[PDB]
Amino acid sequence: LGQGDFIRHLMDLLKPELVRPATTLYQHNLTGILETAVRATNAQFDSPEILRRLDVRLLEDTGWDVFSLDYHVDGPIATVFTRECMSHYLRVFNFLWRAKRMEYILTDIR
Amino acid sequence: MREIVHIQAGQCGNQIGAKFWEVISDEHGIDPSGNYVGDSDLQLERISVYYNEASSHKYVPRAILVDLEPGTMDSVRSGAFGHLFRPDNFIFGQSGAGNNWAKGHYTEGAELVDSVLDVVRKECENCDCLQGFQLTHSLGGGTGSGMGTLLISKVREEYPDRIMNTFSVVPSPKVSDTVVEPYNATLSIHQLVENTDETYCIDNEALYDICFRTLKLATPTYGDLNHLVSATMSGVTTSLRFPGQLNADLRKLAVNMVPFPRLHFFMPGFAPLTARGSQQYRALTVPELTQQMFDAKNMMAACDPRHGRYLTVATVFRGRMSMKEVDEQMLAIQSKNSSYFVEWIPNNVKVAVCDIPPRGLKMSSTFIGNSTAIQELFKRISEQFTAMFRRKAFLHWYTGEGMDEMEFTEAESNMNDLVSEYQQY
Amino acid sequence: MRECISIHVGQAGVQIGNACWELYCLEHGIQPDGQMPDSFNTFFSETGAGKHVPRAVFVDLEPTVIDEVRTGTYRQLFHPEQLITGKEDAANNYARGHYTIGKEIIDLVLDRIRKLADQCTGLQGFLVFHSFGGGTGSGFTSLLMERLSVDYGKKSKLEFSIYPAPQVSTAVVEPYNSILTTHTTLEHSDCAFMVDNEAIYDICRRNLDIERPTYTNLNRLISQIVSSITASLRFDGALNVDLTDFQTNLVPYPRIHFPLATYAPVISAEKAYHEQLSVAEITNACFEPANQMVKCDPRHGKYMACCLLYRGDVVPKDVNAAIATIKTKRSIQFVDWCPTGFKVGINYQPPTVVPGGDLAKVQRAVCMLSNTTAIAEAWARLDHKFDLMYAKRAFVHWYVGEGMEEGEFSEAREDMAALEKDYEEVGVDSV
Numbered sequence: 001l002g003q004g005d006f007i008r009h010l011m012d013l014l015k016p017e018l019v020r021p022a023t024t025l026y027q028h029n030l031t032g033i034l035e036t037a038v039r040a041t042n043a044q045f046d047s048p049e050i051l052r053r054l055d056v057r058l059l060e061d062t063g064w065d066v067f068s069l070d071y072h073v074d075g076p077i078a079t080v081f082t083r084e085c086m087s088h089y090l091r092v093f094n095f096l097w098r099a100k101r102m103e104y105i106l107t108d109i110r
Numbered sequence: 111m112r113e114i115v116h117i118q119a120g121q122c123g124n125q126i127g128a129k130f131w132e133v134i135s136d137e138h139g140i141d142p143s144g145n146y147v148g149d150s151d152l153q154l155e156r157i158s159v160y161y162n163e164a165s166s167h168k169y170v171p172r173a174i175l176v177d178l179e180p181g182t183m184d185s186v187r188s189g190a191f192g193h194l195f196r197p198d199n200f201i202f203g204q205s206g207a208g209n210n211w212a213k214g215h216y217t218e219g220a221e222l223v224d225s226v227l228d229v230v231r232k233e234c235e236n237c238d239c240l241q242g243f244q245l246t247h248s249l250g251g252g253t254g255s256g257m258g259t260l261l262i263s264k265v266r267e268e269y270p271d272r273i274m275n276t277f278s279v280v281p282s283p284k285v286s287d288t289v290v291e292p293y294n295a296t297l298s299i300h301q302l303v304e305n306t307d308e309t310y311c312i313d314n315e316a317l318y319d320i321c322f323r324t325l326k327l328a329t330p331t332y333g334d335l336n337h338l339v340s341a342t343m344s345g346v347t348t349s350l351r352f353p354g355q356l357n358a359d360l361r362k363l364a365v366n367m368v369p370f371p372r373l374h375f376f377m378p379g380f381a382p383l384t385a386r387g388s389q390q391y392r393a394l395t396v397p398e399l400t401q402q403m404f405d406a407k408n409m410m411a412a413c414d415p416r417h418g419r420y421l422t423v424a425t426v427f428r429g430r431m432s433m434k435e436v437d438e439q440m441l442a443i444q445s446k447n448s449s450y451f452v453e454w455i456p457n458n459v460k461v462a463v464c465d466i467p468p469r470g471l472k473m474s475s476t477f478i479g480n481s482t483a484i485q486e487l488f489k490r491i492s493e494q495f496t497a498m499f500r501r502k503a504f505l506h507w508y509t510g511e512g513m514d515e516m517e518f519t520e521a522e523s524n525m526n527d528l529v530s531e532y533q534q535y
Numbered sequence: 536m537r538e539c540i541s542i543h544v545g546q547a548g549v550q551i552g553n554a555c556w557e558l559y560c561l562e563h564g565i566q567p568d569g570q571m572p573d574s575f576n577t578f579f580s581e582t583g584a585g586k587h588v589p590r591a592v593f594v595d596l597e598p599t600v601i602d603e604v605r606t607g608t609y610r611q612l613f614h615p616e617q618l619i620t621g622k623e624d625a626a627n628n629y630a631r632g633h634y635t636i637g638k639e640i641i642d643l644v645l646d647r648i649r650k651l652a653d654q655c656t657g658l659q660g661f662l663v664f665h666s667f668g669g670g671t672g673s674g675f676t677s678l679l680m681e682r683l684s685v686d687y688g689k690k691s692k693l694e695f696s697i698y699p700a701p702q703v704s705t706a707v708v709e710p711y712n713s714i715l716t717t718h719t720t721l722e723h724s725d726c727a728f729m730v731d732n733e734a735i736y737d738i739c740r741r742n743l744d745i746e747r748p749t750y751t752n753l754n755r756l757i758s759q760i761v762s763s764i765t766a767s768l769r770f771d772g773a774l775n776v777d778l779t780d781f782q783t784n785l786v787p788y789p790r791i792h793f794p795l796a797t798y799a800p801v802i803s804a805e806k807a808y809h810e811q812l813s814v815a816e817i818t819n820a821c822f823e824p825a826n827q828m829v830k831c832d833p834r835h836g837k838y839m840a841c842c843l844l845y846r847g848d849v850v851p852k853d854v855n856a857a858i859a860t861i862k863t864k865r866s867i868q869f870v871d872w873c874p875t876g877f878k879v880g881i882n883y884q885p886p887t888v889v890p891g892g893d894l895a896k897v898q899r900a901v902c903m904l905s906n907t908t909a910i911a912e913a914w915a916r917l918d919h920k921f922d923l924m925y926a927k928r929a930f931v932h933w934y935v936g937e938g939m940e941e942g943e944f945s946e947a948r949e950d951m952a953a954l955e956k957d958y959e960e961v962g963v964d965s966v
Contacts, residue, residue: 028392028402032326035387055391111598111622155602239622353599355750356705357546362626366707369929422707432747434736437703454927456920457704
């Protein structure tokens, strides 16, 4: 979440979707929303290569409990991350996602 | 062998047919000048179902381009792949029938249908083993709806045993592109119920939703919509054409999705639909294709299948894939959505698998659905038709062309019988 | 001398025949062009030179699969006139394959089969490979079997049929075709070795470690079964078993003739390395309910006849000890009117591994054909699906408008009910 500008728009577009239960959620729909955010925010001016790996994954309730980004990496660069950094980032990304919706709720009440 | 005669009627039909022949020539490696420039032998193994070999090994599409106005003929001829069709297969008139079903079915449709019937008879007598016909048109249009209807009726009474399947663009729910759309649509559907084996109902608004939400197209033009419809047509007749692990022609699909003669209206679909941005984040697997094709957002008609029950479905897969994965995905789909499938038909899915995927893809699949949610589309058409007919709006045109109010009453009664049958089943 | 003709009908039959004839060519050393760089006589014929033409016909109503055969690696093995094909398939319709499209081809097929029979000296019988839930695999198979019974009213007619699976299914009208085929061929067949795609999928996943098998692996396993069945005709062994032996030892009553096929040493290379597969082990694997290639639990019924066909480094004493162990088991129960329910065949030729296959090279193998009352449950499921679809009268117009009558539907359903009653009667103990 070090970008901030991109995650702001991404939390405004997933609001109408994640409120529904997880059973009606299918991954093929959210990708069009993520792709829309990367185009509108400042993340468009970015290396096309790294943007090819950034996608969504569905953890396996409510839509605010199974959504998370993945950024899969394979090849030579995969010897630095080694399937454990990707099992640690997602362990972190939840705590930064919760502490981000608990704030945009409290600026909506305000 | 298993030759198909393709007829394009009206503006919508002609444009969709032009895109269809573009994608078919791409599949079979045919140059826009008609020459084969492909790489594999399977492209010429079954070129005969769609093409006729001319003198200098040039392949002429077995297509008849019929319209009541010359503008579309000129546009098709002048554009790319326009020097592909036989110049004797452009059968057009001068007055464009307006947006009048009666004009295209009774006054100008008569002369033009005699001419196009002569052309179609020549094309059929040239064929070795005729599999059937396919028509591209729009029900809400003028020459398209009425003339496609008249041609369908006459070809049906000439060739009753052949498979007549149409890819018809139905009126949209929200915004109409023609004021008299319900009249033309109702009359066309009344005629399509009895003289067609497979009607693939396509709505432009569902296509707009697909382009905007799934393909993330900022400015989707009619080219993209026609490309989607052409991909569906491709998939079906590709199951017919190329070798596969589980073959299925037009007649096999007709047998497996038409439980009763009048219940032959389908919602088409296409599984591998991805935006250019998301093509790198998505895994192309049979489960992904199945999940997308059975999604209510992907279906190409604005009829939610969750409001009805699938009588039958057909999945035409393309590419090298494992039959076990296909069958297990089909079983999982049937088990999870047991409430969305008819109980008195066990195994509501017909599976076909072809070995050759479309150009640029590794896997693909088309979804055909005989569901009781088409009753919603026919209900909308019926409400609009009765709303205009009760106060007799825009009716003097149809009456003056030579029709009668009794024909309108019969058409609406037949469409109400159709919705009654769908609701009953 | 003991020549036998194999007939492959439909896509399933033709592809299984592809696998079977690949296996036969590998076993007998015949190159895919018919030349060799006797044993190869019950299935091949010699034409002057080293050319060995297989004694089979490949008949389909669709040019696609047969054309794949005509242009494949075995393009020059089969006689071009024995690869019979139509123009339009039966479209999963029994009526099309039996009445409308099958009548335009049956004469050519019978002429070719007559040529093959005349070329033979002593005809043991026919091997019909087909699928139950296909158009030409049902209608044309039934038509061909009835015509063969009219012509060769004494030769045995064994058919290898792909029984529809309990859950997985590729067609919607499979119950109709299956019931009608069962009617027509049950009138005119000797014994039908049955197999399921779902069961072979489960076998592949559990034993061969394959998570994504195709029809190719299924066809290879089925071809191994057929090779084990015909090894006695093709090779020399301690206990030879002919086709008439199968017919006599596996069919107690004329209608109850649907045994289930099994193959014990289905194992990958590494697992085969770590195991010591012996006669007792392979026999126990054969009688394991999870290794059945028809998805029917044998514990739900009673065995009436078993045909254990061993091959390779097999000792008769070990076979006897293993069979005695099986008989002493309490989970495996036999009908009370068959105190001796084991036909045993032993062959000296170990199974041949196909290059590119998944089965590991083993020293011995066994194929078990078991006639059991557990198939009655599968019949009950099939007729239940038929009853639902026919009560709604779905798809019936497709069959009726193609040379059939609804009376045939009712008669076929009544015949299947009689077959279920017969299975129930033979199941019960004598008092």
